[PDB]
Amino acid sequence: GRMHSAGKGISSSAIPYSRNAPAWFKLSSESVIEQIVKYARKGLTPSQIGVLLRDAHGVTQARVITGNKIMRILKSNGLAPEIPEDLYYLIKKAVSVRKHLERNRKDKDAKFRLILIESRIHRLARYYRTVAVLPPNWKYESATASALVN
Amino acid sequence: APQAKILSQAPTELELQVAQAFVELENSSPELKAELRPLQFKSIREIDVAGGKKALAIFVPVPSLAGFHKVQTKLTRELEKKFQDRHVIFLAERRILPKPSRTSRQVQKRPRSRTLTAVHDKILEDLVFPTEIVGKRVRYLVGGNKIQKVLLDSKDVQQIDYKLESFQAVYNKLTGKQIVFEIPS
Amino acid sequence: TRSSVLADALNAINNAEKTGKRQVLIRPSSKVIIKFLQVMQKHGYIGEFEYIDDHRSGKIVVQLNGRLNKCGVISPRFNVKIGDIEKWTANLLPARQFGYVILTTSAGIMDHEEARRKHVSGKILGFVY
Amino acid sequence: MENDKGQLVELYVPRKCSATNRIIKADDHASVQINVAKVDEEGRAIPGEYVTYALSGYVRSRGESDDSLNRLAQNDGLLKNVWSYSR
Amino acid sequence: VLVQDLLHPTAASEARKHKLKTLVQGPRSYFLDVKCPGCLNITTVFSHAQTAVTCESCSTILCTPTGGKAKLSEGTSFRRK
RNA sequence: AUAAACUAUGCCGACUAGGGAUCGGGUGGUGUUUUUUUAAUGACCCACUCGGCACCUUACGAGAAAUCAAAGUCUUUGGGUUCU
Ligand SMILES: [Zn+2]
């Protein structure tokens, strides 16, 4: 189930049985690349480039029409973020709870829910240091947490 | 001569026969001068189909299989009429690197595209070229032999519908694995 | 989480022999499950099985023909010296004269009988009868 | 089952269920031996010439006895278009 | 029951199953070609789109996101391709 | 940081049986109703599905029994792991 709750939901995307673009697509394998980097220069994460491309430009998913994953295109173009967006959105949520809990510290549930979020930050930053995505120590600090999100 | 610039260095007489079949369309040239000029191939193997026909396998260097796929359907028509009793198919000359044993070491880690189980999958994707494969099943019989089953897309199937008997012979000669093709509706 | 897919597959088969079914569907599938089913097939314990190709891991549908009492897994895969095999066949086989213990030797996955005539040994996977 | 000289032992060989291929024990009193008449032109069921099916008491308790005979008799030509493989 | 064709289930049963519980999982969504009244250009829209998709020209509205399929707005002809 | 802190039933994973209700989300209907003439939503009906709190009937199975769809898949004894 979920890591930090008892929910057992299975809701998920379902990739089709095809490693080729659909026959109706016929834009290019390269004009999509320019449209990938056009959104990235607007400061868009890979998660929200894909939802933007699928909803409007009709790409099913960017691997089957290019061969590359989206942030491999960004990293090849030099638009990779400093920290992953997977870890960035966990830190931003931790700063949001810390700011909230700073002024009304009678929430025993926001103190509980903060611990779950910070534990998830440490588990994920442990993985990133191992695969050399993050610098070898990098030491997520709460006092400097708000600096990284902005 | 532009006939000899397609084959490797010398061989062979059969490579010239297909070479003349290209220049009769390059010199006719409704639109083909813009796309059939750079397209070149490497070799022909002749495979005896279990019927009265035979099969022609065209091997492509594969920076250019995408280029060949533009004129694939049209060019096969102008190869089957001037070569009777034949079935023409286009394949890519892929490289298979051997699996490293605990003694047979190497340098340069072997990419997954060079594995044999991935090359044989790319043969089935390239034998049939239209009618994208919509599934695969493998039967492990009681006796002990394995029979694959390739499920093909129902649309545009009338371009290869007669060639299912030929394809099972070609894939057997290159892989040694049985194939049945089934068309779901 | 899923710790071993071989245990799930053999649990699925064993539950459907008890209920009376003539087929199972197991998911996922691996080379170990394929070889274990191939050893079961050549001794006549199961019928034909078909491997459905997903792009993920695949599923298997296995036809059952009665005549199977138990297929089980041994976890952990204990190391078995060549003189310890008759200590396992005595433990978890119903008689000395039918039934097989499937091992994993460097000569491949095989039952205990022709691990003996090949004179190899290794780790234990399970048993069928 | 036999000895070295091929002489038979095991005082009786048991019946086996024709649906689930399992042994009919000597104390399975819910087991059933179905006898079906063989027929020829103009009806007239031939006496004493049968098509026989055995069902174990496990199957009948589970409620699978009807669906089993529909399969067991359609494959013998006794029925047509009653049992379907694909559910 | 106790004998089934698990390799060839009927199309009705596979249609009434969940998206992941079929024999091979796959998407039940699709893509749509919609004609806004303003211009005549080709716009491809995901059926379960999450962004409020607008045309490249005059950018009004083409669909509104919902918790299910996107609600296509007032009359714009749609194809399914 | 103590409770009959209780479901006196650790947590994760898989399989095995039939049903009718209900909570939240979703899909479908040449359905009902609300009025503008139906429309758009909303409420409702029918069918399906995912995820929940539960319940009813049986017992292939388990148990010392009471009873239990898990307390089953256990002398045919081995899915992973913590505590007692
Ligand atoms: Zn517009």
Swiss-Prot record, chain A:
Q: Which PROSITE patterns match?
A: RIBOSOMAL_S15
Q: Which UniProt keywords apply?
A: Cytoplasm, Isopeptide bond, Phosphoprotein, Ribonucleoprotein, Ribosomal protein, Ubl conjugation
User: Which InterPro entries does the protein's record reference?
Assistant: Ribosomal_uS15, Ribosomal_uS15_arc_euk, Ribosomal_uS15_N, uS15_NS1_RNA-bd_sf
Q: Which residues form the signal peptide?
A: none
Supply one GO CC term from the record.
cytosolic small ribosomal subunit
| Superkingdom field | Eukaryota
- PTM annotation (Phosphoserine): residues: S31
Its main subcellular localisation, reduced to a broad class, is: cytoplasm
Q: Where in the cell is it found?
A: Cytoplasm
Q: Which GO terms describe its biological process?
A: cytoplasmic translation; maturation of SSU-rRNA from tricistronic rRNA transcript (SSU-rRNA, 5.8S rRNA, LSU-rRNA)
Query: What is a GO molecular function of this protein?
Result: small ribosomal subunit rRNA binding
Q: Where is this cross-link: Glycyl lysine isopeptide (Lys-Gly) (interchain with G-Cter in ubiquitin)?
A: K38, K42
| One Pfam family in the UniProt entry | Ribosomal_S13_N
Task: Fetch the SUPFAM superfamilies from UniProt.
Answer: S15/NS1 RNA-binding domain (SSF47060)
**PANTHER family from the UniProt entry:** RIBOSOMAL PROTEIN S15P/S13E, SMALL RIBOSOMAL SUBUNIT PROTEIN US15
User: Which purpose does this protein serve, as stated in its record?
Assistant: Component of the ribosome, a large ribonucleoprotein complex responsible for the synthesis of proteins in the cell. The small ribosomal subunit (SSU) binds messenger RNAs (mRNAs) and translates the encoded message by selecting cognate aminoacyl-transfer RNA (tRNA) molecules. The large subunit (LSU) contains the ribosomal catalytic site termed the peptidyl transferase center (PTC), which catalyzes the formation of peptide bonds, thereby polymerizing the amino acids delivered by tRNAs into a polypeptide chain.
Family according to the record: Belongs to the universal ribosomal protein uS15 family.
Entry protein name: Small ribosomal subunit protein uS15
From Swiss-Prot, chain B:
InterPro entries referenced in this protein's UniProt entry, alphabetically: Ribosomal_eS7, Ribosomal_eS7_CS
Q: Where in the cell is it found?
A: Cytoplasm; Nucleus, Nucleolus
Q: Which PROSITE patterns match?
A: RIBOSOMAL_S7E
Q: Where is this cross-link: Glycyl lysine isopeptide (Lys-Gly) (interchain with G-Cter in ubiquitin)?
A: K81, K82, K122
* One GO term of the biological process aspect: cytoplasmic translation
- GO MF terms, alphabetically ordered: structural constituent of ribosome
Q: Which Pfam families match?
A: Ribosomal_S7e
Q: How is it modified after translation?
A: N-terminally acetylated by acetyltransferase NatA.
- Where does it sit, as one GO cellular component term? cytosol
The main location class comes to cytoplasm
The portions of this protein that span the membrane are none
Listed A to Z, the keywords are:
Acetylation, Cytoplasm, Isopeptide bond, Nucleus, Ribonucleoprotein, Ribosomal protein, Ribosome biogenesis, rRNA processing, Ubl conjugation
**Misc. comment:** Present with 41000 molecules/cell in log phase SD medium. There are 2 genes for eS7 in yeast.
* UniProt cross-references to PANTHER family, sorted A to Z: 40S RIBOSOMAL PROTEIN S7, SMALL RIBOSOMAL SUBUNIT PROTEIN ES7
What this protein is reported to do is described as: Component of the ribosome, a large ribonucleoprotein complex responsible for the synthesis of proteins in the cell. The small ribosomal subunit (SSU) binds messenger RNAs (mRNAs) and translates the encoded message by selecting cognate aminoacyl-transfer RNA (tRNA) molecules. The large subunit (LSU) contains the ribosomal catalytic site termed the peptidyl transferase center (PTC), which catalyzes the formation of peptide bonds, thereby polymerizing the amino acids delivered by tRNAs into a polypeptide chain.
Designated name of the protein:
Small ribosomal subunit protein eS7A
Task: Record the organism.
Answer: Saccharomyces cerevisiae (strain ATCC 204508 / S288c) (Baker's yeast)
Curated annotation (Swiss-Prot), chain D:
Keywords attached to this Swiss-Prot or TrEMBL record, sorted alphabetically, are: Acetylation, Cytoplasm, Ribonucleoprotein, Ribosomal protein, rRNA processing
Q: Does the keyword Cytoplasm apply?
A: yes
The record's annotation in InterPro entries points to:
Ribosomal_eS21 (IPR001931), Ribosomal_eS21_CS (IPR018279), Ribosomal_eS21_sf (IPR038579)
One GO cellular-component annotation of the UniProt record comes to: cytosolic small ribosomal subunit
Q: A Pfam family name for this chain?
A: Ribosomal_S21e
- UniProt GO MF annotations: structural constituent of ribosome
Q: Where in the cell is it found?
A: Cytoplasm
Q: Which residues carry this modification: N-acetylmethionine?
A: M1
Q: Which cysteines are joined by disulfide bonds?
A: none
What's any GO biological process attached to this entry? Answer: endonucleolytic cleavage in ITS1 to separate SSU-rRNA from 5.8S rRNA and LSU-rRNA from tricistronic rRNA transcript (SSU-rRNA, 5.8S rRNA, LSU-rRNA)
Query: Phenotype upon knockout?
Result: Reduction in growth rate, a decrease in free 40S subunits, an increase in the amount of free 60S subunits and a decrease in polysome size.
Keyword rRNA-binding in record: no
Query: In which broad location class does this protein mainly occur, judging by the first location in its UniProt entry?
Result: cytoplasm
Reproduce the UniProt comment on modification after translation: N-terminally acetylated by acetyltransferase NatB.
State the remark under miscellaneous: Present with 27400 molecules/cell in log phase SD medium.
Family, per the entry? Belongs to the eukaryotic ribosomal protein eS21 family.
Protein purpose = Component of the ribosome, a large ribonucleoprotein complex responsible for the synthesis of proteins in the cell. The small ribosomal subunit (SSU) binds messenger RNAs (mRNAs) and translates the encoded message by selecting cognate aminoacyl-transfer RNA (tRNA) molecules. The large subunit (LSU) contains the ribosomal catalytic site termed the peptidyl transferase center (PTC), which catalyzes the formation of peptide bonds, thereby polymerizing the amino acids delivered by tRNAs into a polypeptide chain.
UniProtKB/Swiss-Prot annotation, chain E:
Provide GO CC annotations from the record. cytoplasm; cytosol; cytosolic small ribosomal subunit
Enumerate the cofactors the protein uses.
Answer: Zn(2+)
Q: Which GO terms describe its molecular function?
A: RNA binding; structural constituent of ribosome; zinc ion binding
Modified residues annotated as S-methylcysteine in this record: C39
Q: Which InterPro entries match?
A: Ribosomal_eS27, Ribosomal_eS27_Zn-bd_dom_sf, Ribosomal_zn-bd
| Lineage: superkingdom | Eukaryota
Cystine crosslinks: none
Q: Which compartments does it reside in?
A: Cytoplasm
**What are the coiled-coil residue ranges?**
none
Pfam families in the record: Ribosomal_S27e (PF01667)
The entry's free-text remark on the cofactor is: Binds 1 zinc ion per subunit.
Q: Which modifications occur after translation, per UniProt?
A: The N-terminus is not modified.
What keywords sit in the KW lines?
A: Cytoplasm, Metal-binding, Methylation, Ribonucleoprotein, Ribosomal protein, Zinc, Zinc-finger
The zinc fingers classed as C4-type run over: 36-58
User: What are the recorded Gene Ontology BP terms?
Assistant: maturation of SSU-rRNA from tricistronic rRNA transcript (SSU-rRNA, 5.8S rRNA, LSU-rRNA); ribosomal small subunit assembly; translation
User: So what family is this one in?
Assistant: Belongs to the eukaryotic ribosomal protein eS27 family.
Subunit annotation:
Component of the small ribosomal subunit (SSU). Mature yeast ribosomes consist of a small (40S) and a large (60S) subunit. The 40S small subunit contains 1 molecule of ribosomal RNA (18S rRNA) and 33 different proteins (encoded by 57 genes). The large 60S subunit contains 3 rRNA molecules (25S, 5.8S and 5S rRNA) and 46 different proteins (encoded by 81 genes).
The record ties this protein, via PANTHER family, to:
40S RIBOSOMAL PROTEIN S27
Instruction: Please share what else the UniProt entry notes about this protein.
Output: Present with 43300 molecules/cell in log phase SD medium.
UniProt protein name? Small ribosomal subunit protein eS27A
